[PDB]
Chain length 328, copies 4
């Protein structure tokens, strides 16, 4: 799983993700209008949305849970895998605003409008390991949150406390912790985007045989660490050199580089780990762009073309049928 935040040539903010899994999770695009009451049948817990929500997820006993999404105010949140360094409390903690793991994403999007608003509420917050339904256990997760100011934060609950890191890298991946990755970036300060044409090795002259010689040392594998490295420097390079050319498609070019291909990443259960879908949320415009592994054409769902004061949940069929434009 890879998370990305970007700013277009005309002020707009793009925030999305790569979902990297070896399976399906019955996912669909889910729309929730303003003032919508949600009741969990299992534990009788209630949530009424203050803002309209649009994102990817699934529904259990009429209860919506999200993998990533955005609200009407331009706040976006993505839930990425966090294998070993995560730590949830099994029961509620007194004083703290206790949030069930499955419900954290919705809680961010339904209640708040800005990154700052989320920051403040998260000071007295705690993630509790209570499942959505009794035999549907919570997954190991950590979240990236971004808004229309261009600022992004990272939520990671360790054994010590709930950490809210400022994300000045603009990207998130998976384990280890965020501070580990930021420090790991220092190991790669020798990388150069500019072409290195020649090298004088004494009597022998060494000439570059192709482009991209200045990046030799970049890891090519699909581990969380390597993917963090690639996506961070690819992003940096684009901002530095081609800021005026950043539009919707550039978001996908960066993430495609860290996308898992069928066959190359095999689990111990002998399944192929794929980048099943890539989403991108235009926060200002309230549009959920996404494409899948089977169908690469960008599909757009606009929340402003729905009734935000509606009474029902609207869902959209996950598109896994390749769409080709026939020229002749």
């Amino acid at each position: 799983a890879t998370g990305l935040a970007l700013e277009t040539k005309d002020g707009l903010h793009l925030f999305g993700r790569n979902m990297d899994i070896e399976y399906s999770f019955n996912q669909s695009i889910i729309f929730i209008p303003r003032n919508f009451k949600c009741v969990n049948k299992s534990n009788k817990k209630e949530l009424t949305t203050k803002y309209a929500v649009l994102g990817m997820g699934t529904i259990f006993d009429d209860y919506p849970t999200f993998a990533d999404g955005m609200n009407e105010k331009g706040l976006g949140c993505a839930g990425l895998n966090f294998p070993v360094y995560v730590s949830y409390s099994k029961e509620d903690i007194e004083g703290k605003t206790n949030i069930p793991v499955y419900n954290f994403l919705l809680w961010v999007l339904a209640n708040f409008s800005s990154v700052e608003e989320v920051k403040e509420a998260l000071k007295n917050a705690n993630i509790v390991d209570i499942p959505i339904s009794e035999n549907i256990p919570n997954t190991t997760l950590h979240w990236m949150i971004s808004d229309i100011t261009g600022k992004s934060i990272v939520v990671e609950q360790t054994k010590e406390k709930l950490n809210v890191f400022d994300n000045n890298i603009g990207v998130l991946t998976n384990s280890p912790t965020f501070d580990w990755h930021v420090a790991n970036l220092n190991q790669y300060v020798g990388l150069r985007y500019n072409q290195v044409p020649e090298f004088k090795l004494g009597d022998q002259s060494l000439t570059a045989l192709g482009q991209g010689t200045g990046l030799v040392g970049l890891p090519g594998d699909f581990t969380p660490a390597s993917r963090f490295i690639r996506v961070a420097f690819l992003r940096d390079a684009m901002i530095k050199n081609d800021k005026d050319s950043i539009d919707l498609i550039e978001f996908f070019h960066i993430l495609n580089n860290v996308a898992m291909v069928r066959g190359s990443t095999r689990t111990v259960e002998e399944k192929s780990d794929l980048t099943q879908y890539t989403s991108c949320m235009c926060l200002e415009k309230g549009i959920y762009y996404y494409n899948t592994y089977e169908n690469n054409q960008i599909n757009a769902i606009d929340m402003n073309k729905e009734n935000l004061d509606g009474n029902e949940i609207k869902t959209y069929k996950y598109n896994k049928t390749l769409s080709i434009n026939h020229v002749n």
Copy 2:
């Protein structure tokens, strides 16, 4: 440029295409040439009458077509990839050989021959000469990949000594150094593993895998011809080994997406961004030319069978640079 790829689908169809990695636009369009079309080079008066119908990406200077990558009606496909050094074109013609200009080699293969085996025989007494398409447009240093409906592919490189015709059992191609160098370089990566390594007992310390893809650690991530060659070769192999039965059109694109250049991270000495301008994919049996671009990632299809193969006009199609979004609601 470039990365070349050949692949066999679950239904047993053969896909052959390429990435084009240049930092500019060469005014390209998709060119179609019918059977028995006489192509007249106005600069040097050289004729070419096509035996088979031809379709692919290229450009036209003075009514004369030249290809970067294409295919014919017989399911023979050819792609032209950059080859900086290690290539020597004969300045003047050679006596006894079949003298073929650099710009014209690609069309020569597609217009005259139906199969790879037919090309191999004809290339025994062949030479590539350094004659420009016009006066002011010099020839680019090129090397080619040719594939057909049998599943076999060849690499054609002209060195100072001779014109080499390698067998391509890897199914891939990039750029300099020579093909034989790249094959030998694969041996460095015999320790790569597609399977997950979950743990390692470091004496007293237990090391557990942080995420997926630990076996492929050591793979290069950069965009040099060599590093791109290794990635595309092993990614391909992995898909054949584990998922032979799921190979289809879009799998071709996923493989090449990994070795695709991104804006900003590959900067030429003339401070310009090198990008994967377009990715083409030719379904050889069906004669359909699929392609997307850096600007528009939707695959566009151009079927040559929908045209009159006995026509008398070269037909072109505009190069799509406008993103095609599907508005769901």
Copy 3:
């Protein structure tokens, strides 16, 4: 700077280091006998040794400061560079056992006999930034401590508190923090010591053209992180496969691999960064083995061949003259 701990084929414990610097620090081997009073002229601070000390260091106004050394009871300590993540308090902290940076190494060796003894005292301890002399500022440091039990710890004072990590890796380098390096090891679980002879790449057969194919992916550079990786896996490989063959010279073979060579590592001041010396302490026998960049022959100083109840500091000239054995 690289630190290493090892166990011989016959029970003995070897602990030492690589000193990687672009300069000289007027270093010499320093011997201190039992019950020796040390008075700092600058700040009038006092220290009387409970145990005899032997190690590498220098002397300012009759005050000894150590880079690495051991005591008579078999406790060893090495002080390695810790650039950015270190944090010393400028003044003393009440309650805590405040220790000046320059004096920490001696404080460990003079007062305690075992790793456990040091662990206990370090619970209420703090490192204070007080210089040895007014214009001789303290360096950014973190320490590895090991004894005759085979156990090793790592002392790192961050902004939060004083951390004592259990070193089950048997090695130490430089920044980032120890927990960062231990986590970074997970990225390299795919490494194999065993030869990978062939690979079936479909119709093409790939055959190994030399030995050591299973290690492809190992970093070759001389950064603290890469050197941590190499030295940790080289150590592991030796324990696993050739435990019965581990003697004194094996210690040097491991560290030589991570040793800096003249010319390759240039500082911003255009100086060549070298592995100036490599020390190795046989903790049981009380022998300080070491060799330098100029002279590679192992030189041995035995503390038991000195008067441990003596009255003076004994020093030994740092050997930088190559010693060759003439066979004929």
Copy 4:
């Protein structure tokens, strides 16, 4: 095996030697042969009378010497390194050529020739034949490096087609693939920097160097012939570029120590540990053979000028495997 290295000291003396990377012992000792010594192979009755005095590492089977690496009185040095594939020895003799057995090539160079230029000319009509030193001891697949007091070095590799004699402007050598492959592989690492990169501004995030040697990130750390070749080549270059005036005997060892194999980390398929058994260094002008071992790291010197160069006996010296400690007190 192996890694070969040539280096020029501050005083202008020429050092040539090698690492030997085998997982066993081949009963080796330092062999000395005086002028005009007749070496008689008892198995196949072939003669060799030396023109110059010879010294180096090797072994003796049936009173006949064979070298792994050595030098002569004239300052010509030669080393034999492993060459798994890409080498083809002629099974039987070739008509017209100078037929030289594999085991005998090293001594042939040192006994008959004084300079590299003299060797080059003689190698024009030369061939390496696959004749064993005895009946039951087969020839190892080898390739050689020859250097002299001029500072010039050559690489000699016999392929299926011809006997190649490359110029060595890198001053280094390892093993398979061929020399020309390794030279081309250096081009992949043009972005390596000996100088420290202190910082990198990643937009909003400031990245500062954790330690020293950030420019050389991307360098391979493993012990394959290729990875060893790259490290030894650039480490050498760095020392010449920045510290030309500090080059002396021990600098030779520091360079090779980096590409030296450590016990346990290089495991053969026969589950044995591959080690750098010995590291030799020949001072060509002075005729002194310096060497250390895996067991004893102290450099041992054997001066050939201290012997009677007009002697009538082959003289040997025991291979030192006992650690030499200097007891200070």
